[PDB]
Amino acid sequence: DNSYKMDYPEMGLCIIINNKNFHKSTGMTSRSGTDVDAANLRETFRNLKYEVRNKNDLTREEIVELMRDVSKEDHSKRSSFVCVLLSHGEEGIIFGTNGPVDLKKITNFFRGDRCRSLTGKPKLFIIQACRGTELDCGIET
Amino acid sequence: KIPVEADFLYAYSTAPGYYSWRNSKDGSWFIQSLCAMLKQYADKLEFMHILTRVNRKVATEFESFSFDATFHAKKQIPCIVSMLTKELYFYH
Numbered sequence: 001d002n003s004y005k006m007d008y009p010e011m012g013l014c015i016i017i018n019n020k021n022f023h024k025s026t027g028m029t030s031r032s033g034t035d036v037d038a039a040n041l042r043e044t045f046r047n048l049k050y051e052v053r054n055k056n057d058l059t060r061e062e063i064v065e066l067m068r069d070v071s072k073e074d075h076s077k078r079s080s081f082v083c084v085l086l087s088h089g090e091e092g093i094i095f096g097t098n099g100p101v102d103l104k105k106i107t108n109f110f111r112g113d114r115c116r117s118l119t120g121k122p123k124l125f126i127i128q129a130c131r132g133t134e135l136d137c138g139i140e141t
Numbered sequence: 142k143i144p145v146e147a148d149f150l151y152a153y154s155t156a157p158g159y160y161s162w163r164n165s166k167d168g169s170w171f172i173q174s175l176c177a178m179l180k181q182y183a184d185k186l187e188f189m190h191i192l193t194r195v196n197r198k199v200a201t202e203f204e205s206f207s208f209d210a211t212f213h214a215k216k217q218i219p220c221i222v223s224m225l226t227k228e229l230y231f232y233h
């Protein structure tokens with residue numbers, strides 16, 4: 001048993017949260033080019049046989065209930081789970097269209113004890129977002 | 142029993158504390174590279190190995206260009222955070 005069992009009836013869900021336009025109050029420029037990512041991920045994960053679900057411009061609240069409702073689903077027949085977050089962010093934080101949301105609050109719904117039908121199954125979280133304001137000036141080879 | 146935090150994989154686009162670059166026309170450097178690597182290797186390589194390829198592609202093939210010197214010529218490295226307990230293959 002060095003490899004996860006991926007021969008279940010279904011590969012699993014692939015929830016893609018694509019936040020492009022943020023509330024004026026937040027002062028965050030639109031994430032132009034983000035639709036290209038959403039479409040890319042959708043095609044890519046469809047080939048891997050995942051049940052893709054794209055959600056666009058969700059508020060900090062909508063991200064939570066979405067994640068909560070998904071974790072409350074019966075994943076028994078599914079091999080794994082995937083969630084992609086496309087948005088603005090900071091260390092340990094992902095932005096809803098109206099404000100920040102802690103990454104921990106999101107991932108907790110899937111904790112081994114909180115989502116029994118996904119225990120022992122790989123839970124992937126692809127996060128495209130900033131994690132601070134530092135820039136890598138790189139170094140020459 | 143197993144840890145409740147086990148079997149979790151967090152594939153971050155950039156390292157802790159750093160910016161993550163996105164091209165308004167092609168999409169983010171990370172998502173771009175991830176899809177390409179998955180489309181090409183998901184039928185043979187293990188996930189960690191594919192994500193390592195994504196790491197090299199993003200680190201080598203991408204460099205920012207900006208009229209603002211402050212954001213010009215910047216690089217980026219993604220960050221694989223794995224609490225997985227087994228090898229992951231998108232096939233059987």
Ligand SMILES: COC(=O)C[C@H](NC(=O)OC(C)(C)C)C(C)=O
Pocket residue numbers: 031086087088089090128129130131160161162163164169212
């Ligand atoms: C995932 O793409 C972005 O929205 C991340 C965003 N970074 C970002 O937009 O960098 C630029 C403005 C594209 C150079 C952030 C600071 O969180």
